Design a protein around this ligand. Sequence first.
Ligand SMILES: Cn1cnc(Cn2c(=O)nc(Nc3cc4cn(C)nc4cc3Cl)n(Cc3cc(F)c(F)cc3F)c2=O)n1
Ligand SMILES: Cn1cnc(Cn2c(=O)nc(Nc3cc4cn(C)nc4cc3Cl)n(Cc3cc(F)c(F)cc3F)c2=O)n1
Lengths: 299, 305
Amino acid sequence: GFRKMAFPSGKVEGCMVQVICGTTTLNGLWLDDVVYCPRHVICTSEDMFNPNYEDLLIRKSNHNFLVQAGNVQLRVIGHSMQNCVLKLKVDTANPKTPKYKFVRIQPGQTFSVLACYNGSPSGVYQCAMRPNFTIKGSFLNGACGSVGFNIDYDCVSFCYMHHMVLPTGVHAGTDLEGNFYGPFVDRQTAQAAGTDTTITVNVLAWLYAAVINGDRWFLNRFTTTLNDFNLVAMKYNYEPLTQDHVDILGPLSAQTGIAVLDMCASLKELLQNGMNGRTILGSALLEDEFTPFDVVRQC
Amino acid sequence: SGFRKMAFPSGKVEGCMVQVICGTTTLNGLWLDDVVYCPRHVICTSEDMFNPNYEDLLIRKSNHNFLVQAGNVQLRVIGHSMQNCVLKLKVDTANPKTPKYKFVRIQPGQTFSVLACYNGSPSGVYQCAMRPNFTIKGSFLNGACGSVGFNIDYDCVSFCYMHHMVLPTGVHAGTDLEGNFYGPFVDRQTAQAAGTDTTITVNVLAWLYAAVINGDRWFLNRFTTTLNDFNLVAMKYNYEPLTQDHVDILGPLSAQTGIAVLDMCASLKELLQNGMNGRTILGSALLEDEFTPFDVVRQCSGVTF
Ligand SMILES: Cn1cnc(Cn2c(=O)nc(Nc3cc4cn(C)nc4cc3Cl)n(Cc3cc(F)c(F)cc3F)c2=O)n1
Ligand SMILES: Cn1cnc(Cn2c(=O)nc(Nc3cc4cn(C)nc4cc3Cl)n(Cc3cc(F)c(F)cc3F)c2=O)n1
C-alpha cells in the first residue's frame, strides 16, 4: 500500500508542556532541564503587533513563567532568548527525554507534526517544507509551539516549531534555534508567503510509487534531457531538477526499470498536455510531499 | 486553518507493542496488563499456511514454544488460549504502560488510526477507514501482521482492529480484538476476494462541510433536493445510500456552517454529475470519503487527547 505516513509520536508527546506568561498561553518543548518555546509568549495583547523582545524580556523574571507538564508544575530557574525561541531552565529534568538532535531542514524534505493545544497533543500528521519556506498544516488557535520532527533509530531530529498562520492559510515557524524558515518575523502583522513552486524530485518519486503500485498509464515512450525538462518545468512553476535529484532517484529507477529522464518525459507530457481526467495512486493531482526516501521506506 | 489526514497520538499504543515468535513464525502483539493478544497465524509454519487446523496446531503447542519480547525484556508465557482468530498468551508480568482501554467493533465507514509495527517496534502511524467491503486500504509490509488500529477518547484507547493479511487485490483484512474478522475472510493463505466497494456518502458530505469551515465554498450551490432523489443519483455513482441517521450525524456540522444537509447533498449531486473542473477542495481534486463527521469536529473546532 501507499499512504501518507507520519512517525510515531510517543517520544515527542512526553516532551510537551504548557507555557503561560500572564494570560498568554502556548505550547513548549521540554528537553532535559530546558523548556523551548516561542518567544511570542512574553508578548501581551498590546505588544503583539510590534514587539521589542529585548525590552519585553528584560522586564521579565523567572517567576513570571508558568510551565505545566500536565498536572505537574515545573519551577523556572533561568531564562534566556535565542533568536525567536525562549529557553526556560527548569528545576526538574524530563525523565522521558528522548535521544534528540536539532536540525535545520531544507525545502522539499518532509517531517511529522504533533499538533498540540495547552501542552496536550491532539493529532499527528505529515507535511513538507514548501519551497516558499511555508508549511501546509492543520493548526488551530493555540497550536503555537507544536513541533515537527523526524525519527531515525530512536533519535528524534527536531526541525520545526510552529509560530504563526499566514494570511493565505499556510503556516510559518522556526527551527529549534529560533531562526525562522523564510523571511518571516514573529509579529502579528500581515506577512505574505510568496509564489510557491512544486517540488519536482518529490513528484517523480510519487510517480515511481504509482508504477510500483500498478498505476502505469502515465508512462510514455519518450525521453528528455535534464535541460529540456527544466525548461518545461519552469513554465509550469516546478522546481529545477538537479543531478543530485537524479542520483537520489536511482533506487526508484532501478526497481521499476524506468530511467529518471524517461519519467521526466512522462511528467513533461502530463504538464504540457494535461491530465484530462483520471487518477494516479488515488489522486487526480501530482503529489509533491513525498521525498524519494519516504517512497523507498514505504514501498 | 488547513485540513489534513490526522491520526491520533500514538504514544499510549506504542508502549503495548511486543514481538511474538512461535518457533520461527514471527509476529507483532498487543501487551495489555498480563495478556498478549496476537494473530493466531503465528502457530502456522510454511507448510501450514494454506489450510491450517488451528485447534490441532495449538494442541501441539506449549507455553515454552511462544517467545514474546517486550523491547529488550523477555516475558514468560504462563498460559495460552484461542478466541476465534486471536491467540491470547498470559504472561508473568503485567504491562506497566497499559493505558485505559476498550475493545470495540467498528462499523463500515468509521475511521481509526493504525500504528504499523514490525518485530515489535512501531514504524509509522496513519489514518484509514473500514471500507464498506469490510477491508482497509493501508500501507503494510511483511511483518506488519499484528499492528493494531485504535481511536482515543480522552485518555481511553479504543482498540478496534488488528491486522492479519493482505488480500490479493492489495487491500488489507483483519479482526477485532475478540478474534472476529471484519468481513467474510479467513486466516489462511488462500485467494480471497474482497468484493465491490462503495463510497461512504456521509463521510464525503462531512468533508464538504469541513471545507466550508476552512474557506473552500465554491461548491456550495443554489439548489436543494430530497434524500430519495439524491440516493437515486448516489446509487448511480457507486455511493452508499444516505439514511436519516447520516443526516442526524451531520447535524452538528450543519448548524456551525448554517448549511442544511439536503442543500449540501444537492451540491454533492452537482459535483458528482458535473465534476470538479480542475478546481480543488481542501487540497484534493477528488472527493474524499475517509473523514467521518466526528473527524471533522475533532480537527475543525477540536482539541486535546
Ligand atoms: C489559527 N491558527 C493557526 N495557527 C495558529 C498559531 N498561532 C497561535 O496559536 N497563537 C497565536 N497568537 C496567540 C494568541 C494568544 C492569546 N493568548 C491568551 N495567548 C496567546 C498566544 C498566542 Cl501565540 N498566533 C498569532 C501569532 C503568533 C506568533 F508567534 C507570531 F509571531 C505572530 C502571530 F500573529 C498564531 O499564529 N493559529
Ligand atoms: C506484505 N504484507 C502486507 N500485509 C502483510 C501482513 N502479513 C504478514 O505480515 N505476514 C504474513 N505471513 C507471515 C509470514 C511469516 C514468516 N515468518 C517467519 N513469520 C511469519 C508470520 C506471518 Cl503472519 N502474512 C500472510 C498471512 C498472514 C495471516 F495472518 C494469515 F492468516 C494468512 C496469511 F496469508 C501477511 O499477510 N504483509
